[PDB]
Amino acid sequence: EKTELIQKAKLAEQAERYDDMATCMKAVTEQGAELSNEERNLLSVAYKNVVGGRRSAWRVISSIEQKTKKLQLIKDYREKVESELRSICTTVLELLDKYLIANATNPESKVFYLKMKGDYFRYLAEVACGDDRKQTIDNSQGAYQEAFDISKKEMQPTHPIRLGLALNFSVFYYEILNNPELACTLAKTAFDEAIAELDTSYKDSTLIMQLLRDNLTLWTS
Amino acid sequence: MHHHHHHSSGVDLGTENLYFQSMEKTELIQKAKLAEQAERYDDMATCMKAVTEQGAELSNEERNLLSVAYKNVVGGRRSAWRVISSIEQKTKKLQLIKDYREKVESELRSICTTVLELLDKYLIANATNPESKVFYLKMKGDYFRYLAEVACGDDRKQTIDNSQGAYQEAFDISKKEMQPTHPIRLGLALNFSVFYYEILNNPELACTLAKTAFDEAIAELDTLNEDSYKDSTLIMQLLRDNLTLWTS
Amino acid sequence: RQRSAP
Amino acid sequence: RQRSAP
Incomplete structure (x- = not known):
């Protein structure tokens, strides 16, 4: 079945x-x-x-x-x-x-699921209110952060999952926490570090980098 | 409607009830x-x-x-x-x-x-007036046509006949009662021709049905103010596009 | 695409 | 549009 x-x-x-x-x-x-x-x-x-x-x-x-x-x-x-x-x-x-x-049984998978846990709590936070909002936000941040650490420890900076995680984590920073400069630094960093190792699937990574770069342009307009 | 639900299968919690009947x-x-x-x-x-x-x-x-x-x-x-x-x-x-x-x-x-x-x-x-009657018969035509797209055997024949009868009746009334630029009439011509083209598979009648409706509208277009004009032409574009294709 | 009335 | 991971 x-x-x-x-x-x-x-x-x-x-x-x-x-x-x-x-x-x-x-x-x-x-x-x-x-x-x-x-x-x-x-x-x-x-x-x-x-x-x-x-x-x-x-x-x-x-x-x-x-x-x-x-x-x-x-x-x-x-x-x-x-x-x-x-x-x-x-x-x-x-x-x-x-x-x-x-x-999970391996880092790439763990990062995917933690990112997702991050995203779905973020979707909740978009509509949450009062202290429901606080709990929700904390839960999202914890997941992303754990994912972020593992991704940095285990994956190449061009890996689409890691780039995707950086993208969503920065969005969280920008729209949920509302710290726009950290949002930018989070994205610019991932972007730049990927751009370096592209001389090394390419299409998978650059689809996401375009998104990073686009977000940055907007969050500086 | 915070108190409603629709099933996957296209069956729902139902409207034939006090809840919906007590609403304004x-x-x-x-x-x-x-x-x-x-x-x-x-x-x-x-x-x-x-x-x-x-x-x-x-x-x-x-x-x-x-x-x-x-x-x-x-x-x-x-x-x-x-x-x-x-x-x-x-x-x-x-x-x-x-x-x-x-x-x-x-x-x-x-x-x-x-x-x-x-x-x-x-x-x-x-219905209580021609324009409305035409809209509803056209619709009856359309939904029977959607059935025909997936129908088979003699189920197919019944379906087709029932679509054709609705369209035809609509077609006649629209010709008797409405201006050739009227978007409902044009929309009916458009869908009727598609029926001819894809369901009956008479492509030349499909073209004539559309070319005619198009041409007869094109004549009477300097009539229209901008607002109505845009309504009609949106559909004529579709008529003209279909014709191009059905001659490619 | 054939197209039908909106 | 802000954009997030596909």
Whole structure:
């Protein structure tokens, strides 16, 4: 039943049906074996799209709210989306804790899962409030930081996972903690250190570096 | 709608109930406009379905909200269905693909059935003017066409006949009642021609159907103010594009 | 792409 | 657009 689930996931993906894709990957993960590379990314992409659909909606709604009897109605709808965002995050965080990180068994994988734990807590923080916000933020920061250390200890500065982690960690700095200069330093550093060792897959790394460089241009505009 | 849910399979928590019946139209409409901004079309659909089930005639804005909602809901399946069958046609693993194609098909059908049901029980029943009647018959045409894209055997024949009858009736009324620049009429011509081209597979009739509608609109275009003009031309562009392709 | 009414 | 990891 595992080769099956994986094909249905690759289909669902081609067919842009990410609920299905997710369900499949969640079930593959629950079997409790370590995920291969291709399997990690299938899981990652699936949930990225599922949760991404909510985050998008949440911004549109709050923006429409901030641009304004009818406001109790909008607010209620924002919260329906928030509830959805949380289950999805909880689901993913649960998978990372019960399964993925537990059995990581190598640095590259550990870094991927910790980054992800970082990202999903960050998605929660985008909509959190009061002290819920503080707990959420701490949890995100702890994950990224641990990932950051391991990535520095174990991986080449061109590795797309490490670059990706740097990208997301800087975004966290920039938009969640709101320390914009650290955000820049975090990105510029990763960028520069990668740019050095490119004389050494290239397409995988530079896709992410473009993002680093773009963010830097914006955060200095 | 914080208290609603839709299943994967295109069956939902349902609207035929006090919860939706005790809501004000104005609410449901705002819920829909939001859902639309937020690109959440299941919600938008549910909302409009509930507005329709109140049984009043839909205003123009209301028609289009309904149309757009269901368009996106069903469109997501049609897309997936093409991807899957294309991957199938390119090829043990084929059972699995075929089963998945059928899961999608089942979804396509409920959505179509739902819409066809709304058109029959409510929308057409109470049409009360030509423009509206044309919009709803065109829609009936469209949703039967979506069924035909995936239908087979004699299921296919019934489906096709039912699409053709709706379009034709719409076509006649539009010709009797509406200006050739009217976007509903043009939109109907466009979809009818596509039906001719892809479902009946008479490509020359498809072209004549489109060229005609195009040409007859092009004549009467210096009529229009800028605002209406933009509505019509958006569709004419599509007519002209289809013609180019169907002659390439 | 063939295209149909928006 | 701020952008995050693909």
